[model samples]
Target: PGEVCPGMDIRNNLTRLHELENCSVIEGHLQILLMFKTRPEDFRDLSFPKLIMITDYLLLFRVYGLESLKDLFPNLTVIRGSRLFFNYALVIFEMVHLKELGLYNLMNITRGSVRIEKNNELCYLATIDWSRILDSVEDNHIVLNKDDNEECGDICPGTAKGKTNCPATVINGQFVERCWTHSHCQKVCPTICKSHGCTAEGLCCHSECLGNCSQPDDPTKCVACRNFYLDGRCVETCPPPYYHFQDWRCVNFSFCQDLHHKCKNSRRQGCHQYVIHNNKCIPECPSGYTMNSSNLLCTPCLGPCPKVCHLLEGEKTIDSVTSAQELRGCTVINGSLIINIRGGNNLAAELEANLGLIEEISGYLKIRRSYALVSLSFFRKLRLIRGETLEIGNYSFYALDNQNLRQLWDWSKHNLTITQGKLFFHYNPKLCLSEIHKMEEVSGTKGRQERNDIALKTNGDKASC
Candidate 1:
């Protein structure tokens, strides 16, 4: 309703933004951050309409960042966005006062095309060059332009029924037609003429063809009655016993069928029948079932579902808790375990740190074997320090966990005792394991040590998958 100008510092008005009543201050800050860069987390707490609702205030503040304004008002449909852009373009047009302006060349910009009438009304908003937008994307190879020429007459070719062009229809990259056909146009554009219908092709021509063409009003043309589709006409009436308009043909159509099939499937269906609560699917049980205000799941039929049941871990509530002297022993301890491992002379200390992580993940083994198996296997590989491709009977095992670290640590210790800092593996002029073994005993003990010895053989030629 006022002059829409730009070039203002977004951060300067944070204090003023905080003063605004009935609006989220944090969200306002996020809106300011949008002026610089976009992040999904900035929008996490805000609702769709809330973002648009705040735009009026943003406009008053005169923040000029178009991208930020767009981010805030994302739900503005292609039509709405075009309308807004056209409105602004009209203002620009008026400033120039140029009549019959050629916007075809200007349409080369990303999502840039619109037509304005002499009366200053927006005629069309078009995404004629989405390819430019695609070029700016992270992966530029994605297909952006639709084959509109390929798709034009596949439905209702050349306005056969004298209806407006379909939404998919384009005169020079501008939609003159509504999406629905003549029959659908009557339902969608009720006041409009049946002859000059919506752009949609007749049911017979499109994906689903029933009585939508010849006899829309007749009960004999319904899709369901005609097996959903026929040779060009929709059959309104089938046999009896099938649910029908009581005045028309059949019966037995129940309310459950309507609710389950229609309401559940249709995007246009509103949440009038049931309210969704929490993440779980639970009926809105009123009265006896205490409605959980926080979560949608209905609570107990009698009284409330106790948050602090004096039940031990894995203890069941036996219908009553009042008279029972010993309530359920539920130990609710909340603190994360901290494992601090300082570097030690023993290379196996790294293995110990890794084992801690494996133990933490192992808790889910009973619940999720797949996750446990993969995670444990990964840690096991980490535990294998280094050895050459040691051959077992039929498989070759590379050095177990942190092999590089183990080798580097061993090499450092060896160098400290020798003149040469570098210790080569097999081709070393002098090879010695005597000092290393004497200084540190391996972590795997007794039977495990024996297993390791059996698992590995020096320079053994065996390949494993």
Candidate 2:
């Protein structure tokens, strides 16, 4: 037997490459390797992206496959052979797209030689020459492989007899056979012998055979012959669990089902959990509350007003307390705190209180503790004029008595504590309070200033207060 080789001619390689370029029929049929040398500029101008490439299998065979191309190209598409080369050249071609911008960014300006090394020798795109091979087995083009020398002899069921010889075979009672040329004999006799038993050695009898060798419906392999013949033969049938079709000989249904599920989607509606229904995904309400059946907005049940009871004084309430008189009264029942804020001249004492009872009944509350103090601007006068009707704002103010005021003043001597030991926790992280100044001395070109300017500059004007 003789094997045909493409040999080492650059013209042969180029001609084959050109043939592959034109012939979409035989491309990607086999793996191949290509070797060439050319001008760097011409190579850079070559087009490449049109080809499909794969690099994974090469790394499986060779571990250090990717390291060699680091200098030439930082990235390469995993593809087969000269098609991949074509793709690489196409990337270089784009550096000077339309031939106007110049290949400044596109071309790699290096003093040394540039070489693209491939890891896989059997690159399938340029390597395959499937067009030169058989188009179909049933047609007159059925060319036998030069390797197969052994014949089925009388073992072929339909052709096992001494008559015309015709490669005769006796199956059941009548001897049936077909006489044809050497190539035709190669196709029919061996196929039949492989299926049914013959009178010759290493062959199965018709009575011993379950079905035709070529029938794809049979499940079990034929038991009559072992060395060369078993169940799954041409036109033979499969027994059970195995299914035979035109495309496949005999494949298990379970295996085929598994592969089908793996390669393709089987869901009825393409898996639609996230899809919207009737203009909404089940009609969600706004952030504060749950949606009603009619998709209407409802009041939030989580946060509500804090107070339950209050008192107003005007008509000579509690004797000594006149309309302009200061009322010093306080009470803390259960967890609720009550205080009275007095006004001057014809004004009455305004009482304010916050009880947990409201939140308990409504099941909605946003309540927290807070201390109220006179502002720094009024601290001196408000503390000195205690005998006069001291008018505090409408709030549950914890007044600093003489002793508390002295203690606060002493604390402020060490640190400028304006509000006694109370600061509201800000919900927004960006919000700044002036009280931070009392804690530590900030040393910088900028003092304890607002972070607004700095944050605005870095995060853009969107962060501006």
Candidate 3:
């Protein structure tokens, strides 16, 4: 591909965009800036449909009327940068109406930073899967686009996963937003609001409020009070094993001081069948329990069985050596186990020794970019993946881009089964498809029939037997 002369600049005009139709590869920058009077119709379905590579940066600045980039650059994929301004490859700034970056097919910004800043209405920029497109965005500036609560329909170009585009707002040095709900506002914004309710503006309110205040005239008071709070202020409801009859107050049960007392006392009568949890009496302690309550201690039962392990707790992307060591004795994993050993640590031996103890995974299993790992033999004892019907997509197993991963051991030997979800494997250049096929066959004919859900690709090319 050759470079275009005069460097196509659509400045102070709409007709200049048609000049981009013939240009596929721009050796220099393609700048569309300072179009103050451009309308939404001018750039609607306007894209370099044939463009694939931009040798330099693709800069869009102060273009006020550009609403969405969904149809703007639908085909343009590669931005092979020649120069790095503050380590930025693509810079989009002050496009007040630009709602979304609709570069669905674009992949790889070979070098430099991705600076997207101060575009007030550009809300979906935060939700864009930049890593999915560009191989890396090491130094990126994506901030202060829109209000966190504002909704942008189909904001993230290709998918309807309407993720809000906003920075995590910190109030008094603490991150806040999801905590500003009807039930838990007081707990989160205690210092900010003297009361117990959160407002539409993300401010805490005093007690005697249901949702938010009506106006500034009555700033402290709320429009409606909480259900249990009979008067204006919030009042405590009776503790567990208590019922509310005619009065607003909670009346305690005759047999027990509280719900915990009922379970504690009942355990003395050998009534270990029932237990009190979350202020209510339930028939049985949930799975992963041997007894309802401790007999002598009068406390909740703590079984000899291992606690459900979550190898990857707070961080969802990368797994560390410290967390891998925590899974050494865990027999069951309650949540998804994502093993992505990043950094200089070699966790191959640690995982190989520890992960063999996990017999059941209540959630999905995902292993990606584990540079230290060499095989799935670590999962030799993983017998079952009891996948929950998630509100999002379901996945039983996903192994991607593990450059050193070679084989998946025969999981069927331990009665391994994917009860609800599907399997996926990709980009592990050393891993064999035949091994995956062997595991699929061993999972049973039922799982094998749902072969359409399995996405095994770009690994070893040897055809499955």
Candidate 4:
């Protein structure tokens, strides 16, 4: 019963509770209040280091010089409520110099309410995620705590002296925290806007729009277009040198190179049997057409190019030497090459040895989910990917989710380039984009356009070379 004291009031008795240092549980109310002569430093070292549970009310009223609760009871976690005073479990009131509630670990107030009021310097009451401590504020009395207005000396004219009532509102079903000085009792918008078209500055036009506004006469309206679109209206037309694809959008010869297969289906008659010539789709060689040795113009199939190699996903051998041996004679891949190997350290070496003879990929190349892949040096001999016959959403090159993959090939040293289609790299957390930027710089391609033509993200932080 020694834990159940009548009350341990720190009123003019600063060191009176030295006995509480060894006490883990206090079954009675602990009041630390009315310390006028005490300095803020007095509470600095004053802490209930091991206190875990308080069985009764815990009140801190008019206790000056208390700055933060984090330093006071750094370990307090629970408060069990019994003898209710006006249905309140914990009450903190009129603490002028108390800037923060130090009850950081307080997880429960089993049976009473919470009342924090008239604390002039307490400012962070609203910002705290109270749910982390308590399941809900279902029956709490949270009202009139210090807020932005009180901190800035903008309290209502007579409210500071208790002659007039400061305006009060409710937030998330609880009393609103104090408002800012210029707010004048108006509810402040949340720091993070919830609406897609809205922002911290209140509802307006999206940043992508240049001449349209969500609200009438709103200055934050779209005056012009942004991103892939242009002009004032939300238009999706491509200018010269870029044609519109019904399935996709405005794309050039490079784009059509990867999407040439769309012509095979009668649905896309515009590209049927046509080839990209001078940024325009024109008829290729007649019926028995074939690409020349230089891959320039189409000709008769009398001297056709060598048939492309086709390696299925299951063909990857366990040993790098065996895998390299299988790909030794390959020159071009007619379809896609999806490498899904999971060997320890041999996969990289195998790919390097095997892919040396490959020059062009008529389809796509997708390297995904390799565990030991550290770099793309294996693709040094690869020069062009004539992705003139690919399905929708399938790019020319895709390297995704290879956790340890860090580097792409050195474009300057390899002279490798994607003649058609798009490039995509994602989820290789250690893969830096500076190498890709360097590749774009060396290729004389615009960095902005390269980003638009490719999908690269979640690889590495820095992209600038």
Candidate 5:
């Protein structure tokens, strides 16, 4: 639900830092190079209130003025080590006057490691035990060269209650008997509560809260929801204009359909490669619904899917542009669509222009001996093939001897639907087999309880399928 940002790099100075002002999550490494020129007090009022997750690493180096990360990243919660910087996710190097790393709200370093070095005047760091919040232990530089004058703050954040209630860890390696900071402290959660509060004891998190909460006693504090998420709270049901696609989340009705289509880099990252189903972005369609091939979206069987509108005689053979022009605005053809001509030249383009509209072809679609018929890039908007009438007993779609037919259609180029009939292809020399494999997967054919007649052996062009 959050907007995405690519890997970001900002040089020393606050001028470009404002770019991250509204960012709640970051997908790239964040580096602050040589800020030997500025003091931490100069940017006292600056804060990335909306910034929270960093999917990569956070590298801070030689910024002499910074004493703590309290003001800058007031609520930064997680640094996902999905991508690492020098094998570490949190790297702090050479801050001469730094003391506290007030990344108080940070909960986990999801995957990577950590390192802290050469902050000559730094303190409070040696108190943190790395293993508690980090995914695991590593060759992490627990703390280096701080040389604190023993006048550092008391123990970690939540230990004010008593050291007995606290836990300890080791890193800069001497059994650091107390938590490093607020994030590493042990939580005194009563059975009904969930929290990240290391300082004060918290109250019950909302009953609807899922995993954990950044705050307690309120729905607005939930980090995730047991059901749907609306605005900032979790709810059991969403009102109008919000699509609760799978009850996992809710999104604006208008943009949900296309938002999943917008991200190309998100697939391998934290998000899913979802498509729209019943107006909501979803990774998979509802169990019994159908997934359409055209947009890879879901569609309700929604009654006898609009049958052929303009009925043509049985097996209308098309040989040229004029013959193909018969489908200009026709929504469906009652009978089969057979193309017997090679249309050998740029004639496919000419025929394609007229073969634009059609929904269901009741009979089969047979294309044979069309040497220039490279693909079916033309029947562009056709949605279904009822195949009430089939050729060779089961195959509703048949292709034979098209020496140059390399593909039925390109990926995402078009979506075709055929009822529980069959498909037969033979002698399509250049036709790639993988797209058919892709077509079968998305077309919802396998979801049918019983198998239909589908046979293709030679001419798929490869055995790798």
Candidate 6:
């Protein structure tokens, strides 16, 4: 019920969205991002009743916990759609728990497309006649999946009451009866619009407007054009004879031809989105393939071949992690893991990079003789340990002589398994035994250890959790 917030991007901050409480119309794109932490009741109490339309896109991405649009946007109807993400003007994606889009008063999208995808719990989208609301529905990809566990059970407005109340229309060559919204099968655009387009508030807009103008019947103030845009004005047709569509504007032949002419050549094709490989322009290679940099050709990556990570950095002396770069980008380790880091300046962050990518270790993991080491929490991604090569008698994990080590890795959350050997933790003066037992329990190594496997008298047996 107040002034327009121009280009408001309320992202990840609850205070910022509350600060925009009185904004009636957003003059530009209202990109609400990372709104996943809010509860359903918190969203119901919030309302933007004065808001009639958005000039640009109303994009919601990764928005979780929003149950419905029942109380929020009661009057919000028109999405002018001047700016868009990909082809969509109304974009809702990856919202994990959002249910109904209860914009009951929403009847018109003056321009652009709609794409609501990746919403897991969204409903009532497959029932609405999206072709009736927007100008075109070819580019619209509306809710490819929604709650595979149950049906929406969306009944039309004139379903059980009357026999022939709802008029039918052929969409794809079949007669269908669908509502544009919850109340009306066909919404009545008020006569105040006078054969021209109207805003959600029944205010008249210029016919040439793609949507949204500062004032009615002014083409110069239009946010976007219906047909063409030249200089700073919305025109019914392009001034130049030869022009193609660009967004809502028209690009002349000379401009479009020059854009391609600079990129087009027999030998070196212009590589804007294309890759300049082997003196030719090529599209990007797909996943599950590796590129040969010598000839610039993609070849399929076979199984049991994990990208051959860390060619020279981690390849020396079997597998020793004296530096942090030793295990960078590693998916699988084929040899004994050894770590005696005495030269690193900062052990916490310096030893944390790329440590999460290691999923399996073929040999034993040994971290001995380190003075500044604390918790082994950075190896949270370790899942499997095949102790084909051992350091000592039947021991695969050896955390010995680390003087300042406090905690072992918090392994209760991880699916860690030591398949063939036992843990040997010794002489870590600050390390606690309770944390070690938790790791052993998570990795199924609690009963595999012998009486002297973990020297309980020396490795912080009396220490607290």
lDDT of 5 by residue, 390-437 (tens): 777566777778887776766576677778566666777677667656
Give RMSD (Å) of candidate 3 vs. truth.
Answer: 26.1
| Tens digit of per-residue lDDT, candidate 4, span 14-123 | 77768677665565668888877777888778776666556667888876687776667765545556555577768888888876674544544555778788887775
Query: 1-465 in candidate 6: lDDT tens per residue?
Result: 366576677777566776557776675777777876776766767887877667678887776677676577776766767667676778888877777676765656767898888887777665566665786888887755573446766556766776534445576775555543345454434455533455546567788764345567787765445665566777876553534333344555454444344554432743322222222233444566555544434566663225334334322232224545756767777766666765456566556655666778777788888666777666756788888777768888888788878976665466788888888988887877877788888888989888888887888854664
Best by lDDT: 5
How close to the true structure is residue 350 of candidate 3, measured as C-alpha lDDT? 64
Which scores better on TM-score, 1 or 3? 3
Better of 2 and 6 by TM-score: 6
By lDDT: ranked, best first: 5, 6, 3, 4, 1, 2
Local accuracy of candidate 2 as per-residue lDDT tens digits, 1-465: 011121111231323433223221111212222223322343343332222222111111122111122222212221222223322312111111111111111111111111123222211111111111112212222112111233323222233352253344454464444322211221122345443323324343343232122222232333211111223332333445444321113445444445334433545643211211222221123444443323222335344322222223311122222321232221111122222222222221121111111211111111121122112221111111111111132111122211101111222433221111121122212222222223223211133233431232221122223
- How many residue-pair clashes does candidate 5 contain? 3
Off by over 4 Å in 6: 147-150, 158-168, 174-176, 180-465
Best by TM-score: 5
Each model's TM-score?
A: 0.17, 0.15, 0.33, 0.32, 0.43, 0.41
User: Higher-lDDT candidate among 2 and 6?
Assistant: 6
What's the residue-level lDDT of 361 in candidate 3? 82
TM-score of structure candidate 1: 0.17
In the order shown, the candidates' Cα RMSDs to the true structure are 27.0, 29.2, 26.1, 27.6, 15.8, 20.0
Q: Quote the lDDT for 188 in model 6.
A: 37
Q: By TM-score, is 3 or 6 better?
A: 6
Better of 2 and 5 by lDDT: 5
Candidate 1, residues 28-134, lDDT tens digits: the string is 11223213332345433432222211111121111222212223333221111111232221112211111111122111111223222221221112322333211
Q: Which whole-number lDDT from 0 to 100 does residue 419 have in model 3? A: 78
